[PDB]
Each structure stands twice: as C-alpha cells, then as structure tokens.
Symmetry: D2
Subunit: 481 residues, 4 copies
C-alpha cells in the first residue's frame, strides 16, 4: 500500500513518488500555542502542509486526477490551462511523469509578478500573457479560461482540463486530502480552506458532509477590493458551478495584509507556507473570534472540551518573498547590517593571491606596487617598487575588514584609481603585479579590484610590517636613489 | 518510533515534526532513465531529497545536532553563525523550536545575492555583511567565521556552534542521513555528496566506512575559479580539519554551468532541487564517465550486475531562480508570449464595473463618455454624452483583448488621454462616469485606467452595438442639437 | 594741409579706399563726456572721449592695420597676411588687406580661450582662425605662442606677410601720424592724454607724439590689474617683454579691474558714447589718477594759467561683441528686469491675420466643404455648453484654462501661459490623428476668440491649417436657434 | 545754410546734444559699393550705400527718434517714454530721451518672440522691457498688440508720452528733413532711391521728399517675402494697415527673402561696409529690380542724358547683434572653419610666466622649505626612469600621454588635448589629498617642461600653487650623479 521506507525505485519511481496513495500522508502539524490566540479556549489548530508534497503545492491533487481522467494516450499531445501559477506547474510535472507530454502551455494574467512569471519559465512552461481581469469568469470570452477551452475544442491533439469547470478538481480532495485529514485527526471538528477555483474547499466539504457530518466547513474568500495569490473574492466566486455552496457552512473574508503577516509568522515557527496559508489561518481566526464574541465557541467542542481545527497550507512562500516586503512594513524585518557593503567590494578574493613576504619577494616581468602615503614611502620602502598612494589609507586608518565605511571608501578609491590609463602608465598589463600596503588588508582589496580587471595581481600578507619582521635582512631604500 | 500517520499534535508537535527519527525517512527516489546516461551500463542513481525536510535543506541535520549539544538552557540567549544561507535558516528554525531562542545573528558575505539576502531577513535573521572572500578560512581573522567564534568566546550569553569546526556537524549524518540511505538502499554501491563545510560528505563517508565498506565514497568540489552556492573548491577545503580525507575515495570538480543545467533538468523531471544538487549529480556523472572510459565501471557492480548510486539533493531551487537565467542561455527557456503586456495594462478590472446597457442607462451627477471616432459619434450617439476619440480605436480595429499590440496602444493612449487637466475639463471628478465604445472592450480598458486614477468609472458591456440591440426604443441624436 | 570730405560722400573705384583713409575721413570724433559722468567737473577738469569706434571699421586698430600693411605689403609678392591677435587687430587687417591691397587670405592666430561669440565674429569677417593653446597673451619671443610661430611662417615663405603688431614700429607710429595730431588739433588746450596698453602701440604712439608736440601734457597709461582680465589691454607683468618704447611714452601707469571697466563702459553707452569695455577701462584709469591728485590736493598743477584741465582718453571699440560679459561681470541691478518674462518661454510661434476670420466667412467655408473630409470645426467650450447649442457637425475639445469668464489671454500673461500650455498639451500627435485634422481646414470656436487665435498659432506651428472664428461664440449667437431659445 | 563741425570735436555742456544732431554732425556717409559687388557695373549703374549705421547711435531710427521727441515731448509734464518696437527705435529713444530731454524712464514694449540676445541688448541700453504675446508685428489698431496698449497708456496719463512711430508723421518727416536732403546733396545725379519698409517711415520720407525735390528719381520699396522674416522690415501684407502715405512714396515694391538678405549683408561687411541684415535686404531688392529691367532691356531708361545710373540704398544698422543668425541662416560654407577646433574644449585655464622657473631657482626653493610640509616635487616621468635617477624626496606621478619622445604639446594640438585631459583626469580631489598638495608649493618635473607647464595650468585652476621646472629633466642632468653615471 504505502511506501514504508519512503524509497522509490524502478521505471515508475517518479510516478509512485507523486502518488498520494503510495507516498506517506501529507503532514498534519498542530501550530504552536504562541501562534494560536484561542488555545486557552480549548482550540487546537492543525496545519495540513500540502506544500510538503514533492510538487510543493496543493494543486497537484487536481492536476493528477484531471490528467489521468482526460488524457487520451495516443492523441493527447498538448496541454493548455489558464492558471495563477500553481496548477500549471503541477500540470507540467504530471504531464511529463504520468503521460510523457512535454508541450504544456500556460495562460496567465499580464499582472502576475515577475518572479512568478520567471518560475513558470523555470519549470518549462510555455506562457502567454492575457490582459483584462487577472481572475476572469470561465465564460468571459475575452479571458484566458475561455480561450484555453476553445483552443482544445478545435484540435484533438490539444487537451484543456478545466480546473474551473472539471469535477475531477474537487473530487481529488474527496479521494485524497479529506480521507487523510480524517485519519490523521479523527477528532476533527472544523475544516478550513480558502477558495480560488473552490476545488479544494468543495472537495473537503463534500467529503466531510458524509464522512463526519458534525465537522464544520469554513471557506475563506478575499475581501472586496483586495488581492492575495491563490484565492479569489466572494464576487469572483459566484459564477463558478462547483457545488461549493453545499460544501461550506460559513464564509470568511480576509485581506492581504493579514494573510502575509500570518504566513510570515508560520514560517518563523517552522511551518514554511505561503500567503494563502496565512490567509486561511486568518479566516479560521476570524470565525473563532465571532463564536467567542457570541459565546458560542462551545458548540464546536467534542467530548473532551477541545476543538480540533484543520486548515490547508497550499504552497511555499519563496515565489512571493518580495511581496512580503511591499505589503508589510520594515518593522517586520531586521535591517541589513553593513548594508552599504552590498553595492561595493563586488569581486572575488582568492587565497592564492595572498603571499607570505618571503614568497612574494622571491618572484621579484614583475612589478611591486606600494600603496602607502608618499612620506611613508620615502621614509623607507622596498627597493624597486613604485608608490601609488590613496587618500583613504593612512598608517592610522583602521583595517577595511573591521570598518565597513573604510572598506567602501578604499574599494571605491581603488576602482577609480586603476583606470585604463593608470594600468598602462605603470606598465601593469601582462606583468605579475605584487601589491604592498601597511598591514596587507588594503593591498588584498586591491588584488580583488585588479584581478577583476584582468591584471595578475597578488598581495603581501602582513604588508610592509611583515616584510620588516619576516625578512629583516632585506635592506630598504630610505627617497634615496 | 516513527510517526505512521504523519500527524503531530501536542505541545511538542513542531519538535517532533523536525525530528528526523520521528518524521518519515527523507525520500530516496531513483532518477529517470532519460536523465541517466549510464542506464544501459547498469547504473541506477537515487536522489536523497534532503530538500523535502520541513526545513527544506540538508543543513537542518547539523543545526539540530549542534544546537542540542552546545545550547546551555539557562544562559544561552543568542546564536551567531557565519553561513552561505542554509545553515542560518536552519539554525533560526531549530533555535526557536527546540530552545526558545529568537536572537539569531547571521554573518554573510556581502557578495551573496539580493534574493538570498532577502530570504535571510524573511526567516527573521539579523544579518551582517562581510567583505573580502565570500568563503573565508575559519582562521582568517578578517573573515566572518573568526569574528563569530570570537564574539561568543567573550560572552557566555552568546553561542557560536562552529559548522566549520564542530564535529556535531558531520556526526549528524552518521546519526541520521547515512543510516536512512543504507536502509532505503541496502544494495548501495556508491554514495556521492558535494563538499562545502564537508560535514555532509564526511558524515556519510565515516558512516559507510564501517556500515558497508564496499561502498564507494565520492565527494564533489567546485572547479577552480568557478562558484556554485553550497560547496567550495578543493583549495578552499584544504584548511578544514574534519576527517574528510578519510571519508572520500575520489574527488570530482564540477563547474557552475553544468550544476545549474542538471538542477533545471531534475526540477523538470519532478525532483525539485537546487544548483548544488545538479552539481552533485554532475560529479557522479563525471566519475562514472571515467570508469566507463577506463572500462572499470564493472568494479562498482553488485551481484546482479547493477550499480546503485545515491547522491544528495541539498535544497530547493527557488532562492536561485534568477541565477539560472544569468548562467544558462535563453535557449533553455520558452520566451514569454505577448511579453509586451507585462509593462502595460497594469491595473485591476472589477466585474461590477461592466454594466449591461439597460443597467448603465438607468443611472443616467452622472456623465457618459463615448470613445468612438468623431464622425461615428456625429452619425449617431446617445443624447447627453460627450465624445472623446482615440487614435488607436476605429470601428475596424480589433478588440484589444484579442491583439496584444492593440491593447498596448489603446491602454497607453488612454493613460496619456486621462491627464489631470482632462479629468477637470470634462468634470469627471466626483461623478459616476459611464464609458461607451464600439463593442465595450476599449471602454472596459478605460475603466481600469480611470478606477486606478480614483474616478468612479463604469463601462457598457457590448458597447453602443448592444444598446442599439438591447435598447432599440431609446432614440439617438443623429451632430444635431 | 590735406582736405577732408566735406560731403562725406565717396564715389569712384577708390570709394572704399578713401572711406577708410583717416585723412580723407572727417576726424575721428572727440566728444566731451557730460557732468553726470565727470566727478571732477566742479574742479575744472574736462574729459574728452576720442571715439575710435567711429571709424568705418569700428575699432582703434584700423590705424596700425592701415599703416603696417602700407609699409610691409609687397604688391606682387604678398599674397597672405598672418597675425596673432585678440580680435580687433585681425578684423582690421582683413578689411585693409582687401580694400587697400586686394588680399583675402588673412589668417588669424587666436588663443583657444577666446569666447565662443568672439570666435564666430572672426569667422563672420572672413578670417581664417587657428587656435593656440598656451597663455592667452604670450610674450612675442615665446617660441610656443602664436606671435612667434606667425613670424617664422612669414620668414619661411616670401609670399606671406606677418606685419607683427607686437614689435613693428608702424603700429605705434600710426598714432603719431593720425590719432595724436587729430586730438591735438581737436583739443589744443589738452593737458593729459590717457590710453590703455595691450601691445602698447596706442599709448606709445600718443606719448611719443605729445612728448615733443606739446611737452607739457601728462601721459597716463592704463594696465590690467594683476589677476584680472579685460578684453584689449594687458597687465603690467604681461606688458614688460614688448620692446616698444612705452616706458618712455608714459609719465604714470594706472591699474584697473574688469568690474570697474564694464561698469563705466556701460555708463558711457547709456550716455550716448557707445564704446566697449576697454573704453571704460581707460576712463577708470583716468578717474583713479585724477582722484589721487584731488585727494592729495595736487589737482591744480595739471592745469595751466587757465583753471580748466582738458583730458582726452581713447575709446577703442564697440560693446556689442561683449554684451554677454556685462551680465556676468555686473549684478542683477544696473539692468531693468524683463517683466512678463514668463512669456519668453510660451507663445513661441507666429500669427497671421488671415487666420482670423469674420464669423460669417468662417461658417460659410465650413458648411461649403463636405464635413469631416475637407473641413472640421473645433469647439473649445465646456461640454455642458456645447451640448446646449453648437454648430452642427463640429467637435467638442474642452479647455480647462478657458471658460466664459476668462479674460483675453493678451490682457493677462498668466492666462496666455496657461492656455498656450494646455493647447500645446492638448494637440498631441494622437489628438491630430484622433480627429484626423491633417490635410483639413480647421476652424476654432471658443468663448473668447483670442483663445481661439492662440489655438491657431499652436496648430499651424504643427502643420495644421487652422483658422479662428473672430468674436467667439458671442458673435454667432444670432445663428443658433437653440441658444436663443434657452435664454427665454 | 547751417555749418557742420569741421573738427568733429564737440565740447561744452551740450557736447552730446550737438554730437547726435544730424545738422551739426558731418553728413551720414554715402559710399559707392565696389564693382565686385555690383553686377550691373558694366551697364553703367552706380550703387551708393547710405550708412545710417554711422550715426553715433548706430542705426537709422535715430532720425525718427530725434524728430518725434522734439515734437511731442513736454518739458515740464513729460516724464516717461513708452513705445512698441522691434529693437532699433526704442534704443534710439532711450538715447535721445536722456541726451536731449533728460528723461530716463523709457519703457520698451517688445514681442515675446524677439531673440534672447536682442532682449539683453535692450536691457544693456537701460530700457524697461515688457513682453507681449500676440503677433510679432501687429497692426497699429489691433487692441491686443503693444502698439495700441502703449498708445492708450499715454492717453490715461498726461505725464507719459507715446510718440508712436507707427502713425506719427514726424517719423517719415525726419527723413524729409535730413536723410533725403543729404543724399540729394551727396549724389545730385541720383536716379533711384531704395529702402526697406517696416513702419515705412524711412521709405515714405525718402519718397515724399524726392517726389518733389527731384521728380525724375525712381522710388523702389522693399518688403519681406511672404512667409519669411527679416529683422527690421515687414511683409507687404503686414504693411497694409499703416496709414503713412507709403503707396504714394514708392513707384515699385520688391519682395526679398531672409537668406539673400543675410548673404548680401555678409558680403557688404567683408567689403568694408559694416551693416546688418536689413541692409543686405535693401540691396537685394535693388538688385532684383535692376535685374528685371536688364533682362527686359529697359535698364537704359532709368538713366539720363548720361549713360550712368546712380542709385542710393539705405544701410540701417550694424550686424553685431545678429551674428548668431548668419550662422543659422547661411551654410557651413561662406565661413572658414576653426582649425585646431578641438583646442576650444581643452586647456581652458590661464598661464603665468611666474609659474615657470629656472631649474636652479626651482631646486633651490624645493630643498629650502622642509619637504612634504611646505613643498613637494612631482616627477611625471615613467616609473622606470624615475627609479634610475630623481630628485631625492620627490613623488612619481606617471603620465601615459607623456614620455621622452612626445613633442611639445604646443606644437601638436592632439598632444595638448591628450595631455591636458590626462592631467585633468590625474588630479582628482583624492589625488590632491593623497599627496597632500593643498597649501604646499608644488614643483613639476617632466621630460618636456612644456607638459609640466600644462600641469601647472591645471593645478592652479584647482587652487594648487604649482610651478614648473623649465627645460624638463634635461636641464637638471648635471645635478644628477646617478643619471650621469648610467650614461657611461
Ligand atoms: C487557481 C490556482 N491556485 C489555487 C490556489 C489556492 C486556492 O485553491 P483552489 O483549489 O483554487 O480553491 C490557494 N493557494 C494557492 C497557492 C493556489 O495556487 C492556480 O494555480 O491556477
Ligand atoms: C555551508 C552551508 N551550505 C552547505 C550547502 C552545501 C554543502 O554541504 P556541506 O555540509 O557544507 O558540505 C550544499 N548545498 C547547499 C544549498 C548548502 O547550503 C551554509 O549554509 O552555511
Ligand atoms: C592687441 C589688440 N588689441 C588692442 C586693444 C586695446 C589695446 O590697444 P594697443 O594699441 O594694442 O595697446 C584696447 N582695446 C581694444 C578693444 C583692443 O583691441 C588686438 O586686436 O590683437
Ligand atoms: C520698426 C523699427 N525698425 C525699423 C527698421 C527698418 C525699417 O525702417 P522703417 O523706417 O521702420 O520703415 C529697417 N532696418 C532696421 C534695422 C530697422 O530697425 C523699430 O525699431 O521698431
């Protein structure tokens, strides 16, 4: 039945890996008390981490169930679907794993984020952008849902399962998701899921309608005028023909700021899930808050006085990371320390460029650069070396690697110092350039600058202080010719 | 022992969820034959999807093992670590789940990508950037590894486990990862893992050194001068003091282009993993290619003539999506169709703004805008309406929702049309503005333009062709006053 | 005693030669400056300006140019004239080379730092300019500056000629020949002669002449104050290497800054003595010397047995090439500001009375031609007035800046700016094509008519054949039954 | 018969009044243009230029300005002068208002489209400019243009005065009084008189005078060709509303474009008759009419019993305010290009001979002052030469553009550009602080010495007190033992 060792081999290893009946049950995890403001009221909330399927999103269940139902083995060569992201990724994976179909065309709104659009391309989707409403009605003849079902109707090699209109959508959660939650949480008193196509909620609600009729079925929609990835609003849901009205006992409306806030909290607790997951949990919070404000929370409780709630976590937060910062204030994140270093010191450092004093002077076709101030150079320097001073490097200035502002000034002055004319004015091109400063640190920054400009540059570890220590017998010129 | 139902409840649900002994074994999946160029030679390659731990990366094993070893319950209040990303995310999760520590400070190179830096902030890390080499030696006194261990040495409330120097790193894979692969693949003939801190490889190599001494242990390093997230090069690995030289039988060197290529292929097969995972598989490919070129591949084979290879998949590709496009050519991705629509039609469309002809004219404080050409307006128009023509909208021009170039021209001309002066010149401010065109489509684009500018605008579904059809009794002015 | 042209009429094939001749010409005018410009008038000094700017060439250097070329040019060998110059000398050489000697290949060696307006002036007069990058006013023997290299090129070629104003005695001798004797005859009671020093030819000539012709006249040279720069003269330091006997030609030397030079030059112009910065530079030196003797109480000595003291100073050229510098050197005061200055950036295009049509002629042309293919009528009124009554077949393009209350844009500059800007912002290329205005007669009707004429200026600048209905909508009220009926 | 100033010397408290008086002044010069400019010289026509630009005011409008103000000004009531103008008239009014009438509050009403150089010129002459946005050359009765509004303001206030050049007969009567009689006396054989028409005062005056004083002279007016624009005149269409009897003053009217006007004005200047665009505009009209009769073979009739035909045309003002337009209107030819033009953008800063020091004086100052606190020595040579031998205590700042082979930057313009650019790019603010040059005496040593002087120009423009070692490293070879020993 199920894979005990979670080990999949043979020609069908990937098929069985994605199989919800063969792979272990999708994890169900109770959220911590610190995140559950109804813990003292006896509420225990459990998160169904659909993001932990190998596909990383809840829409793998409709995609699996639809494709096995609708694919015709000899003739089905192309799959087309309108989607907000998750379904077409799941269709792309299942079409290859189960059906050998690599031509998957994704129809998406032109107002889907750039990271999400790049993720579609990443998974090998062929995407076409559509103007107008990002969430059109399946009968809006100007929208991508209509165009998709009409392109597969004129060509039998083209297949359009219809996640907005194909019953195999919600039946996938009667088949898999529902029974899993029931076995994992036999004391379940409330099931909660947000509604986009509504397939997830109606599937769960149709299953629990007869598997445990005492279970309360709570769907979540996006507040009017708001937008969150995954669900749609109550208005955008009315034209859909799935039996969602028979699968829910109450509807909550949730905004995007709460959704992204709770998703961020869940991820920091260890339950890594995306914005719609925090959206769902917030809807559950809002309904529990009504029953407490109405004094009716006792109605959900079982014989032990506890209320076991399960809610769906639909996918991962990674595709939406930038949106968390646009929607949530800076107060939700620690700022970067030494943030200025992101725009500077951009180039690599190789340990082989840093040479011990004896090793560097043995190679010395070759040119030695001294980056100390002009009067320090005249006082004493290695005979044969050129002087090239810097405003930002004294004998007293701190090491650039201990002061981010020093590193910024020194790196920038070094980038401006080593212009093209400068390289030729000192004959650095094509030679082994050895660099020396006071303690070696500014010189090492200079090697990163020069290596990125193609000059074979090395630095002396410890600077001139180490050559005076390690090589005390090498006598030094003290402006004398 | 292990959680049969994958259901975690009680105050320790999250602790047990992250527990590798309590949670099902990390999946091991054989890669498809199409991705395995040595399938006919009898090689079967199995991927250990460490990315499928709830933390989504392999470094959860060192983080778990180190923190339980080093945390002192009463005094340990702050955790500090230098990392390339994975470890500090895993330390942030485990420090909160197992030890109640929320003060986690991450020391990172200034040359880590911006998406990765934002991911650190996302998971609640307090990050400080460090110049110089992005992968310093643990004894480089200018690098972040030294600074981390020295800041926890001066303060007992500060804890620095040392992933580069703490043996609990690699022992975590002797404890968990090794035994899991052995039980999942008893016929294992070769174990493969890339080396950054080397903890993963030495742990696996120390375990199999005595669990099944016939197993070949293959480590992978980054080719000289190259860079891939996770591992380091053979040179950057020499100073580390873990017994990695006793845990490997051969070393492969792999470049970044191959690493990102194979990761992309793995993700498109259904094994969603990041660049170091394709890096590892490529190293395995390169060693198998030597033995075939040397005719020695038979040496790895078991009694049935097959060679069972296991390799580590370390994390997910999502934080690196943009890097795949910089490293791989455009030839690896389908381009966006109607790409021009990404920069235009930027605003939302609400179904309630589109009104049937009878419904819109019933509300008609109110102003009706007609967007048809001037001669068409004079020919016949709804009495009481203003005319506002557009260069890009004829009676013959196609619907904007069927031609992306038409949508771009019309939307841009509409954005330029409805300037501030225009809004006041037609008294649109504060009124209910109804918009009419030929077929309704240009008018609907105009409502998205005007709603985003704060004007309460609605369109007539079907345009003037529908008011002539649905309302044939409403007589129309035909430039007559 | 040569006679001068009493009719100032110059005919014949030598009309231009005689016109430029300081002996045929009337004498260069000498004009006493007014009291309001003479601080020492109450002390008996009379300051007379020698307006060298009034020669046909407009500058003092026509005298050295005439004299040097007459001396140096070889009728059959000379074919090219080359000279280093700051501007005046080489313009004068171009004129004399052609008028008097039939030479047009005149090359001008100039500093690379002379102003961009001045460089164009050299081109304007048909000069051939080569730039030299060293010091602006080099020493004549500096083997880098143009003075030396111009001299050597004239040595290598026997067909080209460098008269060299910097050490040819004919330079300063031309003022012994003309300027000196003229001033002496125009002002016999003269007691002091003043001139700035660039090459020092003008001052050397005046001082050498008056040294013997009237030894009692004081000779006052003017040099540029160190660190400063004035067009024409040189600083004392920059003047020492020239070998003209200028030290023997002056009895004292003043130093003057550029701010004072431009200020006094500007005041002389507003008095009617139109002259450039070096003229105010010379007058300021004279003021400074006269103020030195007045404060020391030695002012009386310069006089004679008469109480008056007659001083003459040189006015070298005209201010027009330097107008820009007066604004940079002097403050925002001493100039009246341009009022309605905002209009300088709007209403940039021409008007034509033919574009403004009587209402009956305009409505006749509109309904003559088929509507929407040959002619359109734009009605700029607010949409709720347009709806009430309008010319059938016309288009409504509302203007926010225009309504039934707005006054004439030509009576308020802010209205003109707002309305011209909105009209310019209204008639984008899409708007022209949205109403298909191209190739059509366009008629404009507004509340005003003045606004509508502004609209015709804007549209015809864009190539649209637009005309306005004179008098506005008020002038066609009698042709609009619906409008007449609404007023019941 | 009033006498004229035979000395051209004007003294006394009325020196400026007499200086501007056309009756005290010598007559405005009349000068025959040369054959090279007269295509019809072989046919017996002699064309004489009346250089009105030679009045002290430099323009033709001083005659209407003098005559109108003399007529209209009220000694005790008049305190402000207001006039719409294109430029010439209102400058002349400012001068006459002060010289002759002691009035300085002169307001100038100008089109908002007059050039930015011309607007500054109005400010320069102390005028008070108000801009008007309508048509540039409005009709005198257009109640929007400045002509009408200037007239009304003078009506509301009995203390201000608009002489109104556009319909005051004293405008054209001033040329019956002066310009006409002068030309007639300067050229008694005259057969034709030619002038452009703006207000038409000049042509009306000349034509009304010659109509009776010598009825046989042909009167040839010139107007601006439709669609074109010339500074001064008007088009025939724009001229019809003025009520001067100009139609009665002309026997024919030519139309001329602006390109021909500027081309001929430029040629007249290079001949020595310095005059502006309207002057070439008048001459081109005369050429066009004479070419019409020559092609028709009716040229002989204009003559007399003599074979010659003497024509006079007006030259109105000077070209200097319009120099920019000649470049825009005419091609790149007719001007010589500036050679070494690249130098105009480099070597922007001054030089001083005191900065260049004899080698012994430079090395003396350097080792006098303590090194690195009061003085530094920069050695611009290549690092491998600097290592071989250098002045002890000096810093090496290599230049790629300079080495022992490079010639003098003042002998090759490309070397000067490269070296000045690299020196400017070398001495960034960090470089000055990297060697702590601020507040120190700085001495420059190079292979050349010329390069080192360029370096001193660059550094002193940045405030660094830099001097150069004259003669370069070659001049200090005797002071360098190590260098002498290497040459064995
Ligand atoms: C509609 C699809 N999204 C459903 C979805 C939902 C909503 O689940 P539904 O089955 O559509 O009701 C929630 N969260 C995420 C991340 C989702 O992708 C889609 O990818 O086309
Ligand atoms: C060093 C850590 N990275 C190790 C790593 C590796 C290498 O595994 P090691 O245990 O360091 O040898 C591979 N792939 C990814 C994504 C990784 O993050 C870190 O996050 O600090
Ligand atoms: C040197 C020349 N300038 C002399 C000059 C002077 C000086 O006059 P000198 O005769 O050169 O000393 C004053 N004012 C103006 C306008 C001048 O042009 C020249 O044109 O090259
Ligand atoms: C109208 C005036 N211009 C007349 C003019 C003319 C025309 O001359 P009239 O006398 O205005 O017809 C020609 N050339 C120049 C340079 C002029 O300035 C004026 O100054 O306002």
């Amino acid at each position: 039945p199920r894979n005990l060792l979670n080990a999949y081999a043979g020609p069908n290893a990937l098929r069985d890996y994605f199989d919800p009946d063969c792979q272990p049950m999708i994890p169900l995890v109770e959220i911590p008390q610190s995140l559950n403001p109804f813990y003292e009221d006896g509420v225990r909330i459990h998160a169904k981490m659909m993001s932990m399927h190998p596909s990383n999103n809840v829409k793998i269940m409709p995609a699996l169930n639809m494709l096995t139902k609708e694919v015709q083995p000899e003739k089905s060569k192309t799959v087309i679907e309108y989607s907000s992201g998750s379904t077409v990724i799941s269709l792309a994976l299942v079409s290859r794993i189960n059906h050998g179909i690599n031509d998957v065309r994704a129809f998406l709104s032109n107002k889907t984020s750039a990271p999400k659009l790049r993720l579609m391309q990443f998974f090998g989707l062929d995407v076409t952008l559509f103007g107008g409403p990002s969430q059109p009605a399946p009968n809006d003849e100007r929208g991508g849902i209509y165009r998709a079902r009409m392109m597969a109707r004129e060509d039998e090699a083209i297949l359009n399962v219809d996640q907005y209109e194909n019953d195999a959508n919600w039946q996938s959660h009667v088949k898999w998701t529902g029974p899993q939650i029931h076995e994992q949480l036999p004391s379940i008193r409330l099931i909660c899921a947000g509604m986009g196509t509504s397939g997830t909620m109606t599937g769960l609600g149709q299953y629990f309608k007869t598997a445990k009729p005492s279970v309360f079925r709570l769907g979540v929609c996006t507040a009017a005028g708001d937008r969150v990835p995954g669900p749609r609003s109550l208005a955008l849901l009315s034209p859909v023909e799935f039996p969602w009205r028979d699968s829910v006992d109450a509807i909550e409306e949730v905004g995007s700021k709460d959704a992204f806030t709770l998703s961020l909290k869940l991820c920091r607790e260890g339950l890594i899930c995306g914005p719609s997951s925090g959206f769902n949990l917030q809807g559950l919070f809002n309904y529990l808050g009504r029953l407490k404000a109405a004094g009716t929370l006792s109605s959900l409780a079982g014989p032990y006085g506890i209320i076991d709630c399960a809610f769906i976590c639909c996918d991962l937060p990674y595709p939406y990371v930038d949106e968390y910062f646009d929607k949530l204030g800076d107060n939700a994140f620690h700022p970067i320390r030494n943030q200025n270093l992101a725009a500077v010191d951009l180039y690599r450092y190789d340990e082989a460029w840093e040479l011990e004093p004896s090793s560097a002077l043995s190679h010395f076709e070759a040119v030695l650069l001294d980056l100390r101030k002009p009067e320090d150079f005249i006082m004493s320097h290695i005979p044969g070396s050129y002087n090239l001073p810097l405003q930002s490097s004294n004998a007293s200035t701190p090491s650039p690697f201990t002061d981010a502002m020093v590193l910024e000034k020194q790196w920038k002055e070094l980038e401006a110092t080593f212009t093209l004319d400068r390289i030729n004015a000192h004959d650095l091109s094509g030679k082994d350039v050895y660099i020396l400063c006071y303690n070696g640190d500014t010189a090492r920054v200079a090697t990163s600058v020069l290596r990125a400009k193609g000059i074979s540059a090395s630095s002396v570890k410890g600077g001139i202080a180490a050559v005076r220590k390690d090589l005390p017998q090498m006598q030094m010129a003290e402006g004398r010719v």
